[PDB]
Design a protein around this ligand. Structure first.
Ligand SMILES: Nc1ncnc2c1ncn2[C@@H]1O[C@H](CSCC[C@H](N)C(=O)O)[C@@H](O)[C@H]1O
Ligand SMILES: Nc1ncnc2c1ncn2[C@@H]1O[C@H](CSCC[C@H](N)C(=O)O)[C@@H](O)[C@H]1O
Lengths: 243, 243
């Protein structure tokens, strides 16, 4: 495969969401993407296969038990061999964005550690984790959805698998029928004028980014054409009434 | 249930990832959370149950076919009744954060529309969607992971189901053993001094937010105690060498 992803999770079956459906599912079946899981529960030795433990200092909540998690990570690393970057999904990590996605996609092998409960022992992050990554400034019940989000995002960059690509939001899209609940498709999109359509899409992207995410535009070096189309969109905006 | 979530998706089975595992799975089995899905494919009438269509204006890629998607949405709305907010998962939507999560959790009913391909017809967003929400500045293959991310995040606020809660990152956590690969647990956490432990955790949160996400601190009104602990952490930081 082009990319191999090792996963450490108490719920391996959750990953069927990406390995059995859609473009990511096709990529897996076609060996373009490989997702292999290791479950800490399989590395426990007590009668009840305990995978959590008490946090020192008290306070509510539990943490992932160290030994089972550590052993699971070691096994994954052994299978991945040298060169596999180990990532821990955490809201305290680097916030994921398209730039980070392209960076991550440069790796041939990745091992994703998914926590549960209140998280994992800080010392494991220091001794076993290479990088911490967050999918957003919000808290989820576990690292599985974040891991799948990361896998899905990077998979789009694997040759054969298939906004922010140019630092801009995407333009509106339209399909049949020509008229929907009284709303028509913009005439230009049905003119067959390839060049005019290209400009419409670019101008729409610029206008939408300016109106919805003006911050994204600031840290962007626009081409001469982009500067022109944006100025046109803003002039058009200033010639109209607004709510 | 406390919260009902209707979902429109071409891959309903993906949602088992949250309805069959962990705390969210328990919440569903216990009727605290209800997730009901409608699949556009079930609303098609042609022999091959076509769910995509060509975008006007050409260009690579396809879009969700309007009729099957529209009909699926209408059915969900009929089942939800009045008061159900309809959300479309999209990278052009409002970027999700803990504040947005708490806002969304105030809804008793939500309908989440998951797109695939290049997205959906802009006119449907205008006629059927109330709000657009993004889980991050990156692009995924479909709206299912984003929808599950939103559901998981809001579920944590449903009574009985169970960083950024106080606008700060969480503190480090530790569990057995006392010594791990030569690294010991901070002595204070094993002192049994409740008050000192509380302060250590708060100071750690402040220090970590300052070092990793200084922007988060700016737009925050710190209490007197928080201002003191942060100043102490910064003074401690300035008394040491750094890499
Ligand atoms: N936005 C996010 N991105 C990546 N992983 C996330 C996430 N929200 C939750 N998780 C992961 O899910 C698990 C349970 S959440 C524990 C959260 C903890 N109090 C803290 O703020 O660090 C953890 O392993 C956590 O890192
Ligand atoms: N970060 C994100 N948050 C919410 N939904 C997302 C997402 N990334 C992808 N999707 C959703 O997954 C589907 C396929 S991605 C189509 C993306 C399109 N070119 C655009 O930038 O709008 C769409 O319905 C899209 O809205």
């Amino acid at each position: 495969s082009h990319m191999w992803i090792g996963v450490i999770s108490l719920f391996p079956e959750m990953f069927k969401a990406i390995t059995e459906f859609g473009v990511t599912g096709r990529a897996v079946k076609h060996n373009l993407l490989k997702v292999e899981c290791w479950n800490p529960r399989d590395f426990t030795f007590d009668k009840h296969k305990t995978v959590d433990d008490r946090p020192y200092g008290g306070g509510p909540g539990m943490l992932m038990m160290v030994q089972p998690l550590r052993d699971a990570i070691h096994t994954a690393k052994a299978a991945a061999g040298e060169g596999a970057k180990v990532i821990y999904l955490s809201p305290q990590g680097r916030k994921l964005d398209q730039g980070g996605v392209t960076e991550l996609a440069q790796n041939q092998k990745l091992i994703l550690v998914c926590g549960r409960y209140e998280g994992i022992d800080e010392r494991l992050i220091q001794t076993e984790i290479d990088e911490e990554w967050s999918i957003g400034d919000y808290v989820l019940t576990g690292g599985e959805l974040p891991a799948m989000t990361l896998i899905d995002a990077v998979a789009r960059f694997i040759p054969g698998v298939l906004s922010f690509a140019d630092g801009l939001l995407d333009c509106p899209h339209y399909t049949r029928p020509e008229v929907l609940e009284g709303l028509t498709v913009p005439p230009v999109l049905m003119s067959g004028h390839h060049e005019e359509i290209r400009k419409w899409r670019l101008k729409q992207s610029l206008q939408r980014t300016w109106l919805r995410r003006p911050e994204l535009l600031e840290g962007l070096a626009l081409t001469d054409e982009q500067r022109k189309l944006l100025k046109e969109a803003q002039a058009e905006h200033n010639s109209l009434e607004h709510h």
